[PDB]
């Protein structure tokens, strides 16, 4: 999606990419994670485009998501559960809710989860 | 959609043939020589097409008396009255800038099948 406007999230351009990939893997694995608020705001669109890849079932889309994610259990669970689960939801698969600030650095925290209503 | 479409649909030109970079064309430009309208033909190879709709432009390259020449036109320019596609080229790029650095038989284009 649209790039980061300011300095990249993990401290460099390459760290932000792998950081997003790990965050998306954990979100798809557990269905809910708690991270910082900017990381969660960056992870929402990036994860939703992978979910869009999983919603439409083709070998080409599976290859694109394997390109980006690199975890085969998570790819299987995407295309077996999450894609079919969202066959009638048109976008907006995730949900960011703000939670209490961290203690060590007082970092604004947040939680991303997958919508389970329809 | 594409806000200024309603101001640009009016001046868009018909009768512009489909042509891609790599194509050999001759472009007929109408030119005034002391208010006397003559027609001058630039026969070359299309090396790019910068996308804009009404502001669409295309660049033609031609080797003339030992010096290369680039002529850049707006696709919907009304000085252009006619574009003839003579042959079709086989390229793998959208912008054949390397032709400015190659001279002669190495400035050749594969003939499209």
């Amino acid at each position: 999606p649209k790039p980061t406007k300011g300095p990249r999230l993990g401290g460099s351009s390459s760290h932000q990419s792998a950081l997003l990939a790990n965050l998306a893997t954990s979100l798809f694995e557990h269905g809910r994670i708690k991270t910082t608020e900017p990381k969660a705001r960056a992870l929402r669109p990036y994860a939703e485009k992978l979910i869009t890849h999983a919603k439409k079932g083709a070998l080409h889309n599976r290859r694109e998501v394997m390109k980006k994610i690199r975890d085969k259990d998570v790819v299987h669970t995407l295309f077996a559960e999450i894609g079919p689960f969202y066959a009638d939801r048109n976008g907006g698969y995730t949900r960011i809710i703000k939670v209490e600030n961290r203690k060590g650095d007082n970092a604004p925290m947040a939680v991303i989860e997958l919508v389970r209503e329809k | 959609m594409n806000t200024l479409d309603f101001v640009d649909q009016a001046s868009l030109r018909d009768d512009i043939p489909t042509f891609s970079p790599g194509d050999t064309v001759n472009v007929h430009v109408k030119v005034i020589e002391g208010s006397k309208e003559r027609i001058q033909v630039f026969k070359g190879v299309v090396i790019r097409r910068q996308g804009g709709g009404i502001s669409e432009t295309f660049t033609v390259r031609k080797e003339s008396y030992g010096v290369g020449v680039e002529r850049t036109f707006p696709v919907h320019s009304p000085n252009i009255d006619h574009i003839d596609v003579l042959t079709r080229g086989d390229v793998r790029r959208a912008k054949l800038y390397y032709l400015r650095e190659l001279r002669g038989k190495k400035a050749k284009i594969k003939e499209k099948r």
Binding site: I97, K98, V99, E100, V111 | -
Partner: protein, 54 residues
């Protein structure tokens, strides 16, 4: 550069005054049937039980 003169108490207390904190604006939520106060930022997260009301 280096301070030329020791700075006076009025001028010291003038911009020590700006180093203050502001109290967060709280609103009420009802959890487990009893009322608590939480920032409006954390209102939803309290309403679905993701902030630890001690």
């Amino acid at each position: 550069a280096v301070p030329k003169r020791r700075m006076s108490r009025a001028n010291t207390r003038s911009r020590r005054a700006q180093w203050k904190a502001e109290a967060p604006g709280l609103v009420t939520v009802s959890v487990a049937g009893q009322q608590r106060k939480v920032p409006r930022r954390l209102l939803k997260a309290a309403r679905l039980g993701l902030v630890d009301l001690d």
